[model samples]
Target: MMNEKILIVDDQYGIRILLNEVFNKEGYQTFQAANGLQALDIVTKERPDLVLLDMKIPGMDGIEILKRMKVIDENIRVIIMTAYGELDMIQESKELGALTHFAKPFDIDEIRDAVKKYLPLKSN
Candidate 1:
C-alpha cells in the first residue's frame, strides 16, 4: 500500500464509504469525514497529502475549508466535489489553491486516476 495518505470529506455516508473502498482496492491509505470538524481534525493530526472535499457541507463552506486547510498544510492538494450549480465556487477554490473539481456523480475511473497520478504509488 502507498504510504501517502488521502482524506475524503463529505456529509454523505454513502460517498465516504464509496470513495474509501475504491482507494482501498487501489492499495492506498485513506481517511473519511462526515462533517467539517471531522475533516479538519484529520487534517491537523494525520496530515493527509490530498483531500477530496464536497462543496456544500454543513458549517464552514467548501472554499472556507480549503482556506483553513491551507493554514495547516499549504501544499496539500484539494479536489472539490460539487453538484451542477456549485460550479460557481470552483473558480474561487482554484484561487485559494484547489487543484481541480469534479461534478456530482463524477466518473470513478477519472477520479481514481487523478488520485493515483497526484498522490502516486509508493516504491516497492
Candidate 2:
C-alpha cells in the first residue's frame, strides 16, 4: 500500500537496487542499506514493515540482523536472501522471525509477487 515501507538490506549493490526498483513501482516506500550498521540505523529510524536481508554481508550477518530487527519492532516482517545453500542459516533465520528465505539468483518476479502479497492492500 502507499503507506507501507519495506527495507532492503544487502551488501550487494545489485540486489538492493533491483529490490528497491521493484517495490517502488508496487507503490510501497522503500529504503536500503549496504551493511549491518546502515541497516540498523534505517530500521531504528524508519521502522520499515518488511526487511529483505542478505545472509553473508561484511558486517553483522543476516541472522544477527534479524535478531536485532526483532528487538527494534517485534512485528517487523523479514525475508532473508542467501547465495550459499546454508540450511542451518535458513533454519536459524526462519526461527528468528523471517517470513521466508530467498536463495540468491532468485527470480525477481517471484520475489516481487511474494513481497507484494505481504503488502497491505491499497483500497481502491
Candidate 3:
C-alpha cells in the first residue's frame, strides 16, 4: 500500500463509499468524514497528506473548512468538490489555499490522476 494518506469529506455516504473503494483499490490509505467539523477532527488526528472536501456541506461549509485546515496545517493540500457550480466559492477556496477544485459527477480517472500526481514520489 502507498504511504500517502487521503481524506474524503462529503455528507453523502455513497460518495464516501465510492471514493473509499476507488482509493483503496489504488493502494492509498484513506479516511472519510461527513461534515466540516468531523473533517477537521480527522485532519487534526490523522494529518492526512491530502483532502478531498465537499463545498456545500451541512454545517461548516467548504471555504470555512479550508480556512480552518490552513490554520491547523498551512502546508496541507485540499481539493474542493461541489455540485453547486459556484465560481465565487471556487475562487475563494483558491485564495484559501486549495490545491484544486472539482465538481460533483467528476471523472473518476481524473480524480485518481490528481491524487497520484500530487502524492510524494515513491522510493525505488
Q: Rate the local accuracy (lDDT) of all candidates.
A: 0.70, 0.71, 0.72
- Candidate 3 yields a Cα-based lDDT of 0.72
Candidate 3's TM-score reads 0.78
TM-score of every model versus the real structure: 0.76, 0.76, 0.78
Q: Which is the leading candidate under TM-score?
A: 3
Cα lDDT tens digits, model 2, 52-120, are 778787655656767776656658777788766787878877676678887777876676667557766
Give the Cα RMSD of candidate 3.
3.4
The better-scoring model by TM-score among 1 and 3 is 3
lDDT per residue for candidate 3 within 19-121, as digits (tens), equals 6676566576778887777877787566777877777876556676677776676687778887656978887777777787787768756776766677663
**How well does model 2 score by local distance difference test?**
0.71
Candidate 3 segments whose C-alpha is farther than 4 A from its true place: 11-13, 120-124
Better of 1 and 2 by lDDT: 2
Cα lDDT for residue 1, candidate 3: 55
lDDT score at residue 21, model 3, on the 0-100 scale? 75
Q: Give the clashing pairs for model 3.
A: none
